[PDB]
Structures are given as structure tokens and as C-alpha cells.
Structure 1
Amino acid sequence: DVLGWRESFDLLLNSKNGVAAFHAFLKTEFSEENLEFWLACEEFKKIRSATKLASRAHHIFDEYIRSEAPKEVNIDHETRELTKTNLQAATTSCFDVAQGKTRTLMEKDSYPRFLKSPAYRDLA
């Protein structure tokens, strides 16, 4: 299980202990919103009902995407505008670009540092 976390970021994100450990690592450097947003996108795509999709999409946008949002993720204006536009036309891949940018924010920086920290090394 712990081996999978370094073989694939996707395996780490599907692990109960992995996610908990990584969330704590991120919280100490004020970037846990990246992980919370990613996970929120994953549950969003499982929604079938049009009404729930609309409601959840608006909450996700207001909580993580719009300027000055409580847990605003570090995305450029280009992506924020794109997401809003997608929100305007109700598309299921509404958050794809934002999720991918946020994923890279983790995968190419905090993820590798997490693996080289006691939080991961002690569990290996």
C-alpha cells in the first residue's frame, strides 16, 4: 500500500492513510485546499441528477474557484474564467482544467516533498 503511494500519485489519493498523511503535510504549509478540491471534483463526477450536479457545481465553484473564495486554489485567471464559462453551459467536465492544474500544483511539488518527509518515510 505504502509502496503504491510513490509509484503513483493516483494510488496515494485512493489510500485512506495516504490521504490523511498527505492532508496533514499540506495543512502545515497552507495548501491542503488543493487536495480538498481534487477530492471534491472526484465525488462531483459521480452525480447523475441534473439538479444535484447544478447545486454541487455551484458550491465547488464558490468554495474553491471564484476570486476570494474561502479555499481558493492557486489557478490563473484564464482557468478561473474557463471554469465559470463551463459553469454557464453546464458541462460535466466543468472542472477538468482546474483539477488538472491543481493536481500538478501537488504532483510536481508538495507530493515529492511529502515522500521525502518523516510523514511518509516513517511509514515506509
Structure 2
Amino acid sequence: SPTPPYLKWAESLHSLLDDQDGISLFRTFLKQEGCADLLDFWFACTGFRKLEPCDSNEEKRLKLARAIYRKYILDNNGIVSRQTKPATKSFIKGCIMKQLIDPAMFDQAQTEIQATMEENTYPSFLKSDIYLEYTRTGS
């Protein structure tokens, strides 16, 4: 009998985010707190970084980088913009403006947001009813 998933989610944020049920439960908790943008931004960067830089998907990667910049960086109100360093935001903005869209261009912002999650919402999620009750009666 294998170690149940909820125990791996308590090992690391990475294990939690590798599991469809854990992603859904973590995102629920963030929605209750008004921080779901942290998790969506985090997944958006991964989605972007895996696209192969080639001339055939250069429009695709460009609108995608623009969409991530527009939704999570440009928006000075949102939680992602307030939790990433100003120099990191200007750097990303530079890449967008000059159209230098290298696959790792969001990686440091993603690292800052990941740190934000491991410092507050991820430990809080592990003390939450959403998680603890999935532990008793989950499917």
C-alpha cells in the first residue's frame, strides 16, 4: 500500500502542485483568501517556459508572454505584482517591450512567487479545513 498523496502534499509545495486534486484543493483555499493569482501565475510561467523557441511558434510565445505580463505584472493592484520585486517586474517589461522572449524570462518572478507561497499560503493551506478534511473523507 503506497504512501497516500495527502502526505506527499505535506512534504513539499512541489508535490502538492503535481497532483490534480492538490492543485484544485490548494486553489480553492487561495480563492477563499483572494490569492488565486499566485497559483495561476506560477502555472502560467511553467506553461510558457516549456514552449520551444522556434520561428513557427514565435507569435504564439509573444502573445503568451504579453498576456502573462498584462494580467499579473502590469496590473499594479493584483497580488502577483505586489509580491514580485520591482527590478524583476521592470526586467520582464523590458523583455516584452523589446520582444526578447527567452523561455526563462519569467523564471525569477516564478521563484519569487513560489517563495511567497511557501512562506504563507502553503503552510496555511496545510492547517486548513479544505486540506484536513480531504485527509479524512477524500476520493
> Scaled by the length of structure 1, what TM-score is found?
0.90
Structure 1 residue 85 corresponds to structure 2 residue 94: yes
SS of the residue corresponding to residue 47 of structure 1 reads: coil
Aligned CA RMSD, in angstroms, stands at 1.5
**1 CA distance for matches of 2:68 and 2:79?**
10
Q: Which residue among 90, 112, 116 is the counterpart of 2:127?
A: 116
Structure 1 residue 9 corresponds to structure 2 residue 20: no
**2 CA distance for matches of 1:26 and 1:114?**
8
SS of the residue corresponding to residue 134 of structure 2 reads: coil
Contact 2:50 2:103 in 1 (8 A): no
**2 CA distance for matches of 1:10 and 1:86?**
28
Distance 1:58 1:94, change over 3 A: same
Q: Say how many residue pairs are matched.
A: 123
Structure 1 residue 33 corresponds to structure 2 residue 37: yes
Contact 1:65 1:72 in 2 (8 A): no
Q: CA deviation at 1:67?
A: 3.8
Which ranges of structure 2 fall in alignment gaps of 5 or more residues? none
Structure 1 residue 103 corresponds to structure 2 residue 103: no
Query: Quick check: 45-54 or 58-67, which moved more?
Result: 45-54
Opposite residue 118 of structure 1, the aligned amino acid is: D
> Scaled by the length of structure 2, what TM-score is found?
0.81
